[PDB]
Design a binder for this molecule. Structure first.
Ligand SMILES: *[C@@H]1O[C@H](CO)[C@@H](O[C@@H]2O[C@H](CO)[C@@H](O[C@@H]3O[C@H](CO)[C@@H](O)[C@H](O)[C@@H]3O)[C@H](O)[C@H]2NC(C)=O)[C@H](O)[C@H]1NC(C)=O
Ligand SMILES: *[C@@H]1O[C@H](CO)[C@@H](O[C@@H]2O[C@H](CO)[C@@H](O[C@@H]3O[C@H](CO)[C@@H](O)[C@H](O)[C@@H]3O)[C@H](O)[C@H]2NC(C)=O)[C@H](O)[C@H]1NC(C)=O
Ligand SMILES: *[C@@H]1O[C@H](CO)[C@@H](O[C@@H]2O[C@H](CO)[C@@H](O[C@@H]3O[C@H](CO)[C@@H](O)[C@H](O)[C@@H]3O)[C@H](O)[C@H]2NC(C)=O)[C@H](O)[C@H]1NC(C)=O
Ligand SMILES: *[C@@H]1O[C@H](CO)[C@@H](O[C@@H]2O[C@H](CO)[C@@H](O[C@@H]3O[C@H](CO)[C@@H](O)[C@H](O)[C@@H]3O)[C@H](O)[C@H]2NC(C)=O)[C@H](O)[C@H]1NC(C)=O
Ligand SMILES: *[C@@H]1O[C@H](CO)[C@@H](O[C@@H]2O[C@H](CO)[C@@H](O[C@@H]3O[C@H](CO)[C@@H](O)[C@H](O)[C@@H]3O)[C@H](O)[C@H]2NC(C)=O)[C@H](O)[C@H]1NC(C)=O
Ligand SMILES: *[C@@H]1O[C@H](CO)[C@@H](O)[C@H](O[C@@H]2O[C@H](CO)[C@@H](O)[C@H](O)[C@H]2NC(C)=O)[C@H]1NC(C)=O
Ligand SMILES: *[C@@H]1O[C@H](CO)[C@@H](O[C@@H]2O[C@H](CO)[C@@H](O)[C@H](O)[C@H]2NC(C)=O)[C@H](O)[C@H]1NC(C)=O
Ligand SMILES: *[C@@H]1O[C@H](CO)[C@@H](O)[C@H](O)[C@H]1NC(C)=O
Lengths: 305, 428, 308
């Protein structure tokens, strides 16, 4: 009785370099380096280092996504005099032409973050997000609570739902009736510009999706003390997931199922669920029967890994 | 002898009569044992500890005992035995049995457990956390008569793990997950119960050494090709159910290869197997059943062919005899539009014949021979019975006219010469 | 021959679900018949099922839900504070919470359910809590959708319920009045675990062979040979592996084997694989052409991985 080399003591140490090289090649789309030489033999620009430092500290599209930083307006224009910073933390909108220059189309844009300054924090407060739909009236989107801290730390926001249609903000406090603050743009480069289970139930595919399965507590499992529910679809997922760079399908539907693919880290291509739904279970025991609430039971969307 | 089973008031009852022989203790929540009241009589040989979790061991309290014969541990949670004592016990080396069921043995625990005592026999590891087996862990275990490797997840095995071991008749490492086994270094094995395990190829080496293992099990295995055995002819039974083979030794007499993808069968696979006695090839996607070999089934005592969608089966236009003998001819979920004429008019040894879901349309030429009927059914026969009286001069005992939907008319004409001779009758 | 592997996967999946449930109840096989009558379901159980079926608008341990209700308006309610023009209040006895959830730390999750007439073009919701006798406490703010089918909203109130259980106050409540610019009572669900279902009633630092992650550091200088990337020089490209053993479902079970399964199989997959779940991005920079560019690559950093 003996086994093979299986994963092998030498193979576990090797091939990760090749796997990560292939992953970077596929994500960057560049099969070969762009060019050799013809580069400035000097220190990197300070703006690039500042952007990297801003995006490095702590607060999905498979293709690589470009990040862009927009500088805050210096609060020197015609309408500055209207807002005198009285009982309201003034904020200003940005220049539309440079937004258009950074992001050519809204579809390419995916998400964005906006950051403030946060220094003293003497009293427990709460920071309101506002949106400038009209010059006279505004709406409410979300609220953020801040914990005291001497060292300032940048915080993000949820402008991803509003910057998409901005093709043409304030700061206040709740009232009882009884570095410059830049905004981050993770757009998409123009060069690299091109899940419900019934979708792949209707059309049969050899890729990794969800296949139909039925479970009933009559004879498939062999017991009967579960009274409710009698029947539900406890589906599964299975499929021979291939390598993304070897096949080179380049399809919108195919590329949407590779948000968790990582052969180098996983060391084996497999399918793993990412989002599930809860399931209540009813059974009888003791004087008064009780009901249990089981979460993370039924798989809904399953991708590769 | 006498014993108390199920009574618990303290750690040691201290009331057993002297020169006792039997001692069984279950559902006894023991706390701690000592080596000052453990030896009231040095004549104990049989003991059992089940549902008897205990950890505080006195580092070999059996040294004062006259002898130890049998040992078994049940529902004992040995988790930090490394600093409790060396191994688990050091008694008189005359051990016969030793069970470690439900103790969660680890690599270090297994290394410490097995010591320089070659008389350890009947060692069981059912329900324990074994990951790997090394060469230095089996030292001092030259015999290891009986093996129980249930519920053990052995995924890596060192080349030649079983070295210097002969009494290896039994080996049941069921409910394991080992990828591949391609080398069989064992020199004396009898039964191999590899079942409910995930195997991915079978490439066992061969040679001039005739292996004497009489049982090979490969159930619930995800193979891809037929697991060819070495050239030895010492084997009596084989199980290959719940397997996947893609088709793209004379002592053997038992076959069980159901739930497969049999599409084309080679002539040699049936020619190189003399003297068979059993077969099981049902619920398989078989379509071609051409018969050209002299004895392609040979001799059988049972046949199960349920859930088979083969088109038609024929012996040969001019075959010299069809089958030597046959007892069971079970088959179900078939689409046999035609009826083979030579299948039945060959021998009178047929006992059980049931055409369930067969749609038999036998010609009404006037069955006649093989007047030794003991079981028969006409489920889903298609065409309705037979215009004249069938089964002439044949003693039929069991009849099942379920789901016939044929020519009945309530006359009961076929049930004329078979009514007085009946054992059990049922119909839909 | 395409119906054989499909049935194999069907039986493997149902076996996995059976094993998951048999480990999930953390006990032996219960008697289905027992002594309970086989009569019609009582109103309480169907009410619980209706409350837990509608969609909303340590974590693997058994979570049990209980039902508590408010008291109809009366002198005691209209004694401390009243309603001038518009006010919606829901408050519940602390003794009811104590008899529902015995230990404050034992509580895990809490949800608040509300009924809305669902006939209004515009509406905004504010949540308030009675932190003291004459002061309130700020809570989360959400939005609403002008729908036409009434349904029950869900709110995250785990912290406030934890605080109320930890406090010995006689009576407290919420507050929901309005947006001020300058037989079908609301339900309650408390997720907890019975005392008899408790167990007492990381791997990176140690050396374990399970599905855990350890260190790796590779740069772009020697082992990779990419001289066109100036920064970063290197990063922690951690990886993890794990056999993920499979438990076959049996009728009998032991005690420690429950946690053994809970560590070897948290999702009961047919073919479990030790794969990452939480991923963190990292950006890189390189110079091409005449303009600088920075791109942030996702699915790079791994923290913990499990097979489910
Ligand atoms: C938003 O960004 C755009 C793009 O940078 C700004 O447009 C730029 O505006 C400046 C003046 O503020 C233009 O400079 C002027 O150009 C004319 C061209 O004839 C020249 O005669 C003037 O002497 C002066 O240099 C600049 O050309 C123009 N850029 C482009 C591409 O047209 C815009 O001003 C920004 N918005 C605000 C409110 O600043
Ligand atoms: C039950 O078994 C344990 C074995 O762990 C016994 O403990 C051992 O007891 C002996 C004495 O009978 C100890 O030997 C003594 O060693 C000291 C030096 O440490 C020496 O000065 C004394 O003259 C004597 O030889 C032995 O060390 C000890 N083992 C240990 C502590 O690990 C225990 O006595 C047994 N109980 C009985 C017999 O009731
Ligand atoms: C069981 O007890 C025995 C006996 O005390 C012990 O095993 C002994 O282990 C030593 C050290 O490995 C062996 O000594 C070696 O002998 C060879 C003979 O050629 C020599 O070349 C080496 O340099 C070394 O000195 C000794 O032979 C061995 N004895 C026996 C009977 O195996 C040990 O304490 C326990 N475990 C085992 C596995 O024996
Ligand atoms: C090889 O190992 C397998 C599994 O490890 C053994 O299978 C065992 O088969 C017996 C019957 O042949 C099973 O007993 C059954 O128990 C159920 C109740 O659970 C009862 O309803 C049935 O009528 C039957 O008595 C047994 O559960 C099953 N598994 C084990 C662990 O014993 C097999 O016997 C071994 N030897 C071979 C295949 O030669
Ligand atoms: C020929 O072989 C087939 C299968 O190899 C035999 O069919 C089997 O028939 C028995 C009795 O009708 C079935 O048992 C039944 O099980 C169900 C639960 O599934 C239970 O509710 C019934 O009361 C009954 O016990 C068995 O399932 C069935 N096998 C399959 C695979 O469906 C057939 O009986 C054999 N023919 C002869 C003449 O022996
Ligand atoms: C809830 O609290 C109100 C007070 O606002 C109280 O009237 C309700 O009933 C009380 O609790 C008793 C149960 O222990 C109940 O039997 C009795 O009617 C009443 N007790 C007193 C002293 O008034 C409370 N309901 C509960 C606790 O279920
Ligand atoms: C980005 O951050 C890095 C490190 O956080 C900065 O590098 C430091 O620069 C200061 C000068 O201000 C030096 O005194 C330190 O020795 C540098 N540290 C390291 C590790 O190099 C860098 O200057 C920042 N870039 C910008 C544009 O501010
Ligand atoms: C909700 O209650 C209604 C009223 O009896 C009932 O018909 C329905 O089945 C319930 N829904 C459940 C139990 O999921």
């Amino acid at each position: 009785l003996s086994t093979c080399k299986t994963i092998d003591m030498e193979l576990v140490k090797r091939k990760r370099i090749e796997a990560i090289r292939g992953q970077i090649l596929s994500k960057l789309r560049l099969a070969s380096p762009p060019s050799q030489g013809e580069v400035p033999p000097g220190p990197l620009p300070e703006a690039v280092l500042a952007l990297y430092n801003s995006t490095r500290d702590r607060v999905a599209d498979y293709y690589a996504k470009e990040v862009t930083r927009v500088l805050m307006v210096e609060t020197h224009n015609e309408i500055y005099d209207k807002f005198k910073q009285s009982t309201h933390s003034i904020y200003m909108f940005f220049n539309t032409s440079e937004l258009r220059e950074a992001v050519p189309e809204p579809v390419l844009l995916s998400r964005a973050e906006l950051r403030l300054l946060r220094l003293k924090l003497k009293v427990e407060q709460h920071v309101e997000l506002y949106q400038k739909y009209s010059n006279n009236s505004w709406r409410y989107l979300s609220n953020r609570l801040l914990a005291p801290s001497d060292s300032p730390e940048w915080l993000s926001f949820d402008v991803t739902g509003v910057v998409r249609q901005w093709l043409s903000f304030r700061l206040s406090a709740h009232c009882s009736c009884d570095n410059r603050p830049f905004l981050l743009l993770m757009a998409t480069p123009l060069e690299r510009a091109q899940l419900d289970t019934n979708y792949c139930f209707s059309s049969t595919e050899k890729n990794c999706c969800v296949r139909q399965l039925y479970i009933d507590f009559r004879k498939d499992l062999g017991w009967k003390w579960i009274h409710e529910p009698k029947g539900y679809h406890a589906n599964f997922c299975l499929g021979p997931c291939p390598y993304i760079w070897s096949l080179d399908t380049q399809y919108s539907k195919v590329l949407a199922l590779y948000n968790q693919h990582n052969p180098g880290a996983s060391a084996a291509p497999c399918c793993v669920p990412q989002a599930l739904e809860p399931l209540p279970i009813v059974y009888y025991v003791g004087r008064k029967p009780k009901v249990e609430q089981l979460s993370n039971m039924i798989v809904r969307s399953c991708k590769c890994s | 002898a006498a014993d108390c089973r199920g009574q618990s008031l303290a750690s040691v009852p201290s009331s057993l009569p002297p020169h006792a022989r039997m001692l069984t203790l279950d559902a006894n929540p023991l706390k701690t044992l000592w080596n000052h009241s453990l030896q009231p009589y040095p004549l104990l040989e049989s003991l059992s500890l089940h549902s008897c979790h205990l950890e505080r061991i006195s580092r070999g309290a059996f040294q004062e005992q006259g002898h130890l014969r049998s040992l078994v541990l049940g529902d004992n949670c040995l988790s930090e035995n490394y600093e409790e004592t060396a191994a688990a016990l050091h008694a008189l080396p005359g051990l016969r049995r030793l069970d470690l069921s439900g103790n969660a043995l680890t690599e270090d625990m297994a290394a410490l457990m097995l010591q320089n005592l070659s008389s350890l026999r009947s060692v069981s590891l059912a329900g324990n956390t074994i990951m790997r087996l090394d060469d230095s862990v089996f030292e001092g275990l030259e015999r290891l008569r009986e093996l129980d490797l249930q519920r053990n997840y052995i995924f890596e095995i060192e080349g030649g793990a079983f070295d210097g071991l002969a009494e290896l008749r039994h080996l049941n490492l069921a409910f394991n997950n080992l990828p591949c086994i391609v080398d069989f270094g064992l020199t004396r094995l009898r039964v191999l119960n590899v079942s409910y395990n995930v195997l991915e190829w079978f490439l066992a080496t061969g040679g001039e050494a005739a292996f004497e293992l009489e049982t090979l099990d490969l159930s619930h295995n995800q193979l891809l090709f037929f697991p060819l055995l070495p050239q030895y002819s010492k084997l009596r039974t084989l199980l290959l159910r719940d397997n996947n083979m893609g088709f793209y030794l004379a002592d053997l007499r038992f076959l069980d290869m159901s739930q497969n993808q049999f599409q084309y069968l080679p002539d040699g696979f049936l020619r190189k197997m003399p003297s068979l006695s059993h077969l099981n090839l049902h619920q398989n996607c078989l379509m071609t059943l051409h018969i050209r070999e002299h004895e392609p089934p040979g001799a059988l005592t049972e046949l199960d062919l349920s859930h088979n969608q083969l088109s038609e089966l024929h012996l040969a236009p001019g075959l010299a005899s069809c089958l030597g003998s046959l007892r069971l001819f079970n088959l179900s979920s078939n689409q046999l539009l035609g009826v083979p004429p030579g299948l039945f008019a060959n021998a009178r040894n047929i006992t059980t014949l049931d055409m369930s879901h067969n749609q038999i349309s036998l010609c009404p030429l006037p069955f006649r021979n093989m007047a030794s009927l003991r079981s028969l059914s006409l489920e889903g026969c298609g065409l309705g019975a037979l215009p004249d009286c069938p089964f002439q001069g044949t003693s039929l005992t069991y009849l099942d006219l379920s789901s016939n939907w044929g020519v009945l008319n309530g006359s009961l004409a076929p049930l004329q010469d078979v009514a007085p001779m009946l054992q059990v009758l049922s119909l839909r």
